């Protein structure tokens, strides 16, 4: 949108920190990390958040919780509430991101009280989001949660092509079976299936939903 | 009069006050009987709650009826707040699992609290920050742990918020069902009893209506 000053702007505006836009470019430090880079470790101090301004980031546990992208942001759990990393953040392609401190975020709060109504919003949508993914655990079986995984990553990575619908997750089988908590070889015969059965074309990091309903049928 | 200071003292310990004096914000309370469904999930939401005496089971049910419990509340703990941050449907069910007096506000409510003290926001921040890391570890005990290591987890979670001394004991009131802790742990109700009736054969614990006394917590927390 070239309404926002930056491309940085835009996706930080799409993050939820501000709510314009001269006014936004009152910006922050940008920072470039490699493919297959861990930016922070689970059990490390945490002092720092990080937004994602292009790239994707998987976070992981011991478990893949969620890939985020584009104006996603992660490292704020210890920000709000000071421990340790409650997870590793790595990143599956190359990514820039912005970050900033618990000083640095509590004097853009002061400045603008507002911002934590946002911040608010987006931990109860984990929240609600992470309620969905373990009662899933409960009460879906294995090809069930392999059909939502695989459009829950289209709602945030897909894009309409024909349609539908091309969903570039940037992830292998086994960081796939890892989201969904099985075996890979559990989640490798249901991507068969599915793809056998004519509802997804699977091509390496990407996968053509051609049958959002069925597979949103299968769950 | 007790019983008001009690309600401040109750109330004055809830997350979204650890940052405030007073206090006296805090003058619309609310009794319910047990068993009160006090919201439905999916139900339009406008109104969080925070106990003053009691106990709520927050729950979903799956399409077959199954049901799990995410957690249970018991004083000042609040409830109803996700959907006033994030404008939506109930994610889950709020139901009474004993009698319960609250005290309750609304989304206009909490926004005038919020612009007046921003250090409610901050500690609101640290309580949903906080449900979430437990959830994240609730769910990967559900992939990782066997059910006798969530019992004892699960009884030793409930310690931490509902315990009291009794000599050299903890005694958890939890005022749950069998079904209920099953619902908890995510394990069926007779593997949920048998890891409960070994704890106890083994002196670790005792079952005493709907509490248990804690006899032996480093063992019991060895356990899981
Ligand atoms: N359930 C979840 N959903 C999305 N992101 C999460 C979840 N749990 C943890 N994270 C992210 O992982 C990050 C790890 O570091 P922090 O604990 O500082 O902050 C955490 C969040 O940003
Ligand atoms: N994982 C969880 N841990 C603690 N409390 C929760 C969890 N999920 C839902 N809740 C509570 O249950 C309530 C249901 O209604 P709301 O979604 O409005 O607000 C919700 C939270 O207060």
Redesign the interface.
Known sequence: NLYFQSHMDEILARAGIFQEPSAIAALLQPVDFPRGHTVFAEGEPGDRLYIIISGKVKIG???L?TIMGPSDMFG??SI??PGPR??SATTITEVRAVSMDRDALRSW??DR?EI??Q???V??????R??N???D???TDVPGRVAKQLLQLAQRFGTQEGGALRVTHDLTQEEIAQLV?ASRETVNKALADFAHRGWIRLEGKSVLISDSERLARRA
Do not use: H, K, M, Q
């Not at 931990?123 to 609600?128: E, K, P, V």
């Open positions: 546990r011991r478990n919780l704020e759990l709000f509430d409650t997870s709060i002061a009280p934590s109504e911040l608010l919003r931990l109860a949508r984990r929240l609600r992470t309620n993914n373990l009662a655990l409960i009460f908590g």
